[PDB]
Ligand binder design. Structure first.
Ligand SMILES: *[C@@H]1O[C@H](CO)[C@@H](OC2O[C@H](CO)[C@@H](O)[C@H](O)[C@H]2NC(C)=O)[C@H](O)[C@H]1NC(C)=O
Ligand code: NAG
Ligand code: NAG
Lengths: 13, 624
């Protein structure tokens, strides 16, 4: 099942 | 004729058949207008005989296991306004004869095994509104030019396909299209400027392709635009100023591209912007103050760019901000205290900048802040006592700054704090006993500071997993109460003034994988207890101390130890106790008083001869 629309995963330190 | 699931026309003939949400298996009245067999777990092919129901208008076979091709006879049904084949096993091409269904409105092919190209025939469907073919990995080829002829399209999605090439300029003819979703595909070349002709466009999702060129300026003339996801492409050039002209734009994600230039001041006019993600680009300039006029902003991720200047104080105006990521930039100046007027902040990451000054006390007044990451900056001054106020703080990283003074005791007030890294600063005095109050604390990194005084078991929480106190001035003895932390995976005390024996209580740290005691004043004999910790696996470093006596026989029991360094001590006797450790990878015995022969084995043969030369009697011998 293809993934629904999403934003760029945020990345913190 | 009504039992259930069967409906008749007025004239008395069977009209509609519907069955769903049952459980079944296996393969599957010429007046029937509507046929739904859906979610039936059906297998096999679609019988070509389907094409014989001439009055068919709806056909929904979706959410089954059907295989084989889509029979071309299916396209004989000239009365079909809905065809749902989605979520099946279907393979093959979309037949050209698709163009013959002249009244088709809805077409759902998504989540299948389909391959080939999209026929140039789709252009003959004048009533087509929704076409969703995504989630077919081998659907390939360029989007056909003829797509511009479907005048009624609202929804188009090809996501997670192998669709390649540039989107045709044809796309600008779709004057009613609302959502274009083609993401996680093979697209390359520039977004065509003609896309600015699609007046109803609301949502543009092109992310995770190879799209190159720049973001067309024409995109600012789309007045209904709401969400723009262009993330993870090759996009180049500056962000169009004209985007400030899209009153409805609530989400902008350009993350992971090549964009340069400046964040445009015009963004200040977007009164609906909730989320701005520019992360991982080349954007230069300063954060423009006009950005503080977007009152609904929850998410600002500008990390990994070239942004210079100071963080604007008018940031207090964004009262809904949950997340602020500016890390890996050129930011300078003080962190503004007014940032604490954003009461909802969950996560602040400012790491890897030039920020200077003290950490403003007010930021610790945030009752919802889980993550505070200020690492790698020029920050100096004390850690404020107000740190005790930040009730929900989970992850705290202040490492890589100039911070001075003692660790404030009120940090013991924080019951959710999991992870704390203060390493590489100027901290002084003792580790505060009150830190025993962080009941959740699993990771404590204090390394490379001026920390001083003694070290107690009562001083530390028993939930600790990771401890690094290395590179300090810590002194007196490693307390017996160290045996109280039974969760401790990794303990690094290296490069201190520590002294006395290693307490036998160390034997009760049952989880200890890594132990670094290197570079201290430890003396006496390595206790037998150290060999009783089967978990010792990653590393054991006893080097650069005063240890004497012999390697304890119990050391034969560390069957998992990969790295062992006893070097630069007064150790004596031979190595025989070590000879059977099969997982021992690295061994450093140099600068000791060892003597005796070692077997000729690839292990001992790999030991540098200078290592044997710094001992008393060590040599490789050959067995008789
Ligand atoms: C952290 O919590 C402190 C304890 O209440 C708080 O303290 C004071 O500020 C109030 C005014 O708001 C003063 O009337 C009071 O004298 C202060 N209390 C003490 C004992 O120092 C801090 O202001 C809080 N810090 C932050 C940044 O919110
Ligand atoms: C053991 O400790 C010494 C002293 O701190 C250090 O220089 C050495 O590299 C450490 N050994 C290993 C194997 O990393
Ligand atoms: C002992 O040898 C290991 C492996 O060669 C090395 O990493 C470590 O630096 C050495 N210890 C010291 C004190 O130099």
């Amino acid at each position: 099942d293809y993934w629904k629309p999403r934003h760029h995963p945020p990345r913190n330190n | 004729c009504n039992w259930t699931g069967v409906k008749c026309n007025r004239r008395g003939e069977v009209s509609e058949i519907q069955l769903k949400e049952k459980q079944l298996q296996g393969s599957l009245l010429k007046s029937l207008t509507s046929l739904t067999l859906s979610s039936l777990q059906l297998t096999g092919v679609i019988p070509k005989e389907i094409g014989d129901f001439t009055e068919l208008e709806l056909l929904d076979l979706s959410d089954n296991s059907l295989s084989g091709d889509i029979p071309v006879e299916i396209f004989r049904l000239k009365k079909l306004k809905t065809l749902s084949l989605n979520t099946n096993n279907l393979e093959g091409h979309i037949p050209m004869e698709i163009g013959n269904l002249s009244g088709l409105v809805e077409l759902m092919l998504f989540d299948n095994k389909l391959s080939g190209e999209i026929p140039r025939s789709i252009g003959e469907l004048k009533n087509l509104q929704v076409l969703r073919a995504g989630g077919n990995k081998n659907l390939r080829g360029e989007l056909p030019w003829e797509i511009g002829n479907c005048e009624n399209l609202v929804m188009l999605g090809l996501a997670e396909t192998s669709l390649s090439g540039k989107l045709p300029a044809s796309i600008g003819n779709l004057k009613r299209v609302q959502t274009i979703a083609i993401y996680t595909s093979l697209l390359s070349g520039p977004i065509p400027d003609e896309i600015g002709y699609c007046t109803e466009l609301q949502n543009l999702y092109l992310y995770q392709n190879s799209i190159s060129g720049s973001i067309p300026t024409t995109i600012g003339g789309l007045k209904k635009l709401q969400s723009l996801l262009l993330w993870q492409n090759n996009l180049v050039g500056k962000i169009p100023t004209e985007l400030g002209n899209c009153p409805e734009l609530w989400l902008i994600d350009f993350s992971e591209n090549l964009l340069t230039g400046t964040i445009p001041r015009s963004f200040g006019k977007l009164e609906n912007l909730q989320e701005l993600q520019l992360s991982v680009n080349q954007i230069s300039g300063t954060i423009p103050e006009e950005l503080t006029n977007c009152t609904k902003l929850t998410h600002l991720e500008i990390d990994n760019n070239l942004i210079t200047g100071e963080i604007p104080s008018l940031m207090s105006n964004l009262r809904s901000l949950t997340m602020f990521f500016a890390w890996q930039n050129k930011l300078t100046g003080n962190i503004p205290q007014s940032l604490s007027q954003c009461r909802e902040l969950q996560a602040i990451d400012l790491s890897y900048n030039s920020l200077s000054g003290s950490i403003p006390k007010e930021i610790f007044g945030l009752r919802n802040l889980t993550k505070l990451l200020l690492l790698s900056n020029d920050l100096s001054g004390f850690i404020p006592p107000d740190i005790g106020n930040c009730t929900n703080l989970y992850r705290l990283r202040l490492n890589g700054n100039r911070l001075a003074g003692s660790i404030p005791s009120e940090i013991g007030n924080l019951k959710n704090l999991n992870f704390v890294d203060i390493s590489e600063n100027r901290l002084v005095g003792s580790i505060p006993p009150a830190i025993s109050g962080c009941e959740s604390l699993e990771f404590l990194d204090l390394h490379t500071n001026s920390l001083s005084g003694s070290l107690l078991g009562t001083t530390l929480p028993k939930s600790l997993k990771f401890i690094d106190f290395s590179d300090n001035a810590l002194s007196s003895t490693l307390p017996p109460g160290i045996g109280l932390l039974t969760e401790l995976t990794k303990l690094n005390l290296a490069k201190n003034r520590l002294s006395g024996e290693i307490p036998r209580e160390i034997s009760t740290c049952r989880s200890l994988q890594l132990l670094n005691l290197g570079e201290n004043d430890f003396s006496g004999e390595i206790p037998d207890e150290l060999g009783q910790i089967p978990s010792l696996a990653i590393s054991l470093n006893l080097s650069c101390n005063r240890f004497v006596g012999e390697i304890p026989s119990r050391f034969s029991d560390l069957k998992n130890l990969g790295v062992l360094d006893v070097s630069h001590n007064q150790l004596t006797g031979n190595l025989n106790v070590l000879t059977d450790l099969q997982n021992l990878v690295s061994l450093n015995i140099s600068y000791n008083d060892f003597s005796g022969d070692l077997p000729n084995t690839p292990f001992f043969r790999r030991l540098p001869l200078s290592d044997l030369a710094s001992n008393r009697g060590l040599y490789i011998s050959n067995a008789i």
